[PDB]
C-alpha cells in the first residue's frame, strides 16, 4: 500500500491563497504511481517512492 500523503507531496502549490491545505494548490506533478518504491522502515506494508 502507498503511505497516506504521498499523493499530496509534490502537489503544485500557491502560497498566497491560504495556509497549508490541499485546497491551495493545483495538481500533482509527479508520476509516483510508477516510480521505484521503498518500504517505509517504521510501518511494514507501506511504501513510498525511493526519492
Amino acid at each position: 500500500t502507498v503511505l497516506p500523503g504521498v499523493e499530496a507531496i509534490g502537489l503544485g502549490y500557491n502560497p498566497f491563497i491560504s495556509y497549508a491545505s490541499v485546497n491551495s494548490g493545483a495538481v500533482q506533478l509527479f508520476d509516483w504511481a510508477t516510480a521505484k518504491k521503498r518500504e517505509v522502515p517504521f510501518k511494514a506494508g507501506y511504501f513510498v517512492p525511493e526519492i
Binding site: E7, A8, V22, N23
Partner: protein
C-alpha cells in the same frame, strides 16, 4: 484526473432566545356619605383595570 484527500468537517450553531413581559394594574375606589336628620345618602364607586 488528480484526486486529493480532503477529509474535513465544519459545524456552526447560532441560536437566540428572547422573552419580554409587561404588566399593568390600576385600582380606584370612592365612598361618599351624606347625612340630614331625616335623610341618609350613600354612594360607592369602584373601578379596576388590568
Amino acid at each position: 484526473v488528480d484526486v486529493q484527500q480532503n477529509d474535513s468537517a465544519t459545524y456552526t450553531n447560532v441560536s437566540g432566545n428572547t422573552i419580554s413581559e409587561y404588566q399593568r394594574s390600576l385600582a380606584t375606589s370612592v365612598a361618599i356619605e351624606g347625612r340630614y336628620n331625616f335623610f341618609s345618602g350613600s354612594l360607592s364607586t369602584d373601578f379596576d383595570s388590568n
